[model samples]
Target chain A: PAKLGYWKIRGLQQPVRLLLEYLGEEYEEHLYGRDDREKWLGDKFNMGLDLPNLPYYIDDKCKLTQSVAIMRYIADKHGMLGSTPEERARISMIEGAAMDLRMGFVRVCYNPKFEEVKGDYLKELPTTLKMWSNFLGDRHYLTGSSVSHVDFMVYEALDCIRYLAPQCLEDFPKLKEFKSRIEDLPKIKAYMESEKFIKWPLNSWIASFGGGDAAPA
Target chain B: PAKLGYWKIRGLQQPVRLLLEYLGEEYEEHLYGRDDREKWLGDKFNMGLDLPNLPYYIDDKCKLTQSVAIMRYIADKHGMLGSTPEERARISMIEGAAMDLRMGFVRVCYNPKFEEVKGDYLKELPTTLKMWSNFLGDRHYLTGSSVSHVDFMVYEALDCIRYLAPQCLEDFPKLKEFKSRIEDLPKIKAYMESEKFIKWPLNSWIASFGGGDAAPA
Candidate 1:
């Protein structure tokens, strides 16, 4: 078994953990970013990882950064990238869209003066929500009838916005269904219940599987 | 020929249009801001897109948003989705990470209240620049030795940053080299230098390709 070092950050690490746990692979989890954040920062720099960014992975072999790349590496390893051309293309589209929407939200979240940009942020939400919902309009999963990497992204992205816009999904019934369906995956549910999962408060806040408020749309 | 009611600001639309030009694909550029901003605001009620965002594409058959998704769709049509599975996965990894850094930079670049977050924002730049440079350390393309979707993404993502941080790449010599390597591609060079290549006033500030950037490292 490869000893996996997943620096614990709720937002970024969840997808990687989900991918690994979905495959039922066993490894190590380093709980980073405690109240004394500087210690973990040192650890990261010493270990050759850029600190303060979780979802940085250290396999027995190599160290990697960028959450998306790590998750893709794991997904590809587990046959999670889909088995056909159409599936891969569709997966890429949904994942890309979810990432775009998440980027839109994160832009607002990281801003110290979000109040000043609140108008632009607020104005963009509804339409962005509408566009996302319509993209997932008829499907149970973002790119297919079954689960794909895109489905996980859909869940994670909604989790990011859940706190800021709780009712964002009430308007998009189909999206609501899509999210609910993914959340109920047995492995994820079991993983959510374990102490390994329970130790992190950031994990639940990331209710990427749980749908949240309608973003003004 | 179906109608394309493209809704986008100039900064975000250049690569889409550039790719179309590169492929010699004919499509009308429906510039959506400025004059019709008010028109779009009111028409949101009946909009077909689930999200009300710019860079949304509409043809008679389908309406899609998400800039990367659109890039890949057009890439697929033009036979640009790489030539093999590993190539495609590597392309996704490169494109995805390029996107993450691009979005991260957006926090400081376009945020009008950048002053409030200036300290923390500037603090993150060195690490990000290192992360990107580290990722590109010795690779020819982001993924492989051949040109791929990620090469285009790298060109476009940096193009966006060049808009605000004129000296953004002054420190990251590797990024400068990476962008230059892609531009050196024959068709890409032709598309960039062609008559229809609408060079926005944006490109002026950043380092233009090699420009004596210390040769990457």
Candidate 2:
């Protein structure tokens, strides 16, 4: 009944997709692969988006862009904005933090000097993960037992870092466990098993790091 | 009765301060200026912040960081989140859009290559303001007549751009009018006139642009 559009990759829309599936909301996706890239931009003007950007979501209610706003739209329909004011504030802060993590990964992916910058990123990553670990310590979810909108955000960002350093989360057992907690969500787990999931090429084709499709394990 | 802390400049905390004044809330400011820069970082670990960042807010309810989250906390307290579901969604989207504007400005201000990139940025600024103009067409606030959390955000961002191009809002009469609507808010107008207002050096001292304290108007 709704539509989501982004590049044919998991870059910005994974969390949105995960949230929709977790909510069991049916929607269609418009993916722009290499050949369809220019076509998407041409179609952008037609979409009537407030800000014509990728990772857009449209329903009968509204046409929306910006990945965070898209998730908040779904989150608003559902009760996922967080149950309390403190939780809500926590969600917004986590949104900011997870975004920081994603932007870092995105920076690496889009940079031609990715290899040169890789060490510095990896070297300081543990310290970064430590903050998340400390915040998440022993909780079922980041804020509490209840899942908020930011869990999806954190999951995608953490997954991005995992792609680079698989063992990055090893020391942060809580984070590692949290990753599995999201992965094991029945609907999300099933989605991954299905061919519908775009597990690799986490960014656009030009991205030097995660631009190609992943092979079978 | 509450507390907010950021740099002496008007960068991230202006929205928070503006929102606070608009609400007639009493709060103390912790401004870390040039000499106090190193001191703030030293005090960072002492604060019991979840993420430990600038532009932090501590009320009896919660201790929060992330500029948007801080405002949302106040918004939640004051019933300013939105009047309806649609309005809340609109506020969130505006938050995303306004933050985009702020980040673009921040990138230029903090960048050493600003001179080289200034031409390209200025070239696209009109197109950028056009979107904001269209969004705010004939509305008292960005979303509607009633102000929401994003009003402060959009105001701060537009003001940042105005600092760079004093006549930037010349073509967008709606945006210009919208800027005046915010400025004329009694408490905000009073606050700006008060000695307490830090009106210049829109960013940290390290920024190559807008870092110096402004002389008298």
Candidate 3:
């Protein structure tokens, strides 16, 4: 089984967890809360990996850090990115763009200058939402035909926005439909309802721009 | 042949260019300039790619945006990331890690509040350099024996640092060695010595952290 470790809050681990759930792969999680972060991380460094960081994955093959890398590592194993090199490239573009949007969200939600930038980000939110919507067009996923890892990534990002800026996506029907479609999937729907679900802070350790701080581990 | 479009300055395109140089792939570059920015981008949006951002790539298969996406697209096509699943995971981790480092550099170098953060970033620079050195360990490349896209990404970042913080890598002999080794590659050496290279302004816009701005195309 794969062993993954990160802060108790979702933060970087959410996408990785979502991918695991999508694949129905079982893995162990060593989640550290604020009170235990230092000690847990110390143990992690002592154990040693090439480059240790939060949201690290330790499996039979390798120990990996960086969320996108870990997700791609797992996704590649299950062929979730795409079937062909070109297809994967298209999917990777979505993955990169989704991450860029998520990073902007993180800045607004957690950065000390949040108040100053919040208005601008909210104002510009529609452009991003519409861009993704246009990308989706008539397709069920961001990429045509089959679902790729980018869908899960975009779905998570859109979920965060829905929490933070509920009315922002109103003009983008395809995105709204995309969100519902992902949530309505049997496995994802069950996961959302499960006790294990992380429903509070989109990021750990700070007050979310959406609503509340992360719940305790 | 593939087509890559970006500002004439290195910016995000440096790593991508380095990868192409390493693989000896020929692609047409649609390098724009400050004066040409508006006209070029206006034409780009009119073209059919969804989510078209600067540093976009177009080929027979698909048109893509986002630097990491473009690089991964090419890297995957050329089999430069890594061979086995495990090797690729390790390479992906490096790629992700390199970008994280680059983002930090961008923040300090390009953010309007450079003066406020410069001192602090310089203070902590040693730790980041040391981390990469430790990660490099005894391996010839960051991953292992062969060069990967991560190497190109990392090399460009380190090169940027050499310009901005010349004394930073002095203690990291391995890093110094790595830099020399990569630069000594025949094609890379020729490119570096060529007039087409943008030696200043590690980033395209604003003034560089060092002395000068990017020369206009």
Fraction of native Cα contacts reproduced by each candidate: 0.24, 0.60, 0.78
Q: Give lDDT tens digits, candidate 3, residues B125-158.
A: 8988998999998888886788777888899889
What is the clash count for each candidate, in the order shown?
Answer: 16, 0, 0
Model 1 residue A207 lDDT score:
33
Ranking by lDDT: 2, 3, 1
Order the numbered candidates by DockQ, best leading.
3, 2, 1
Q: Which scores greater on DockQ, model 1 or model 2? A: 2
Worst 10 residues of 3 chain B by lDDT: B208-217
For residues A8-35, write the lDDT of model 3, one tens digit per residue: 7766678788878878889978878768
lDDT of 2 by residue, B1-217 (tens): 8988998888878998888889988999888877887899798868799888888888787888898888888888787776556567767878888888988888778766778877788888998899888877777987677877688888988887777788899999989888899999888899999999888877776787777766332
Global Cα RMSD, each model: 7.0, 2.4, 2.8
lDDT of 2 by residue, A91-171 (tens): 888898788888888867666577888888899899889988988888998868877668988998998788789889889
Clashes of 3: 0
For candidate 1, the docking band is: acceptable
The list of candidate 2 runs beyond 4 A from truth reads: A35-37, A212-217, B213-217
Candidate 1: TM-score?
0.72
Residue-wise lDDT of candidate 1 within B80-117, one digit each (tens)? 76564444545555666766665555445444455566
The parts of candidate 3 lying over 4 Å away from their true place are A207-217, B207-217
In candidate 1 the C-alpha lDDT for residue B57 amounts to 60
Better of 1 and 3 by TM-score: 3
The predicted structure with the larger DockQ, 2 or 3, is 3
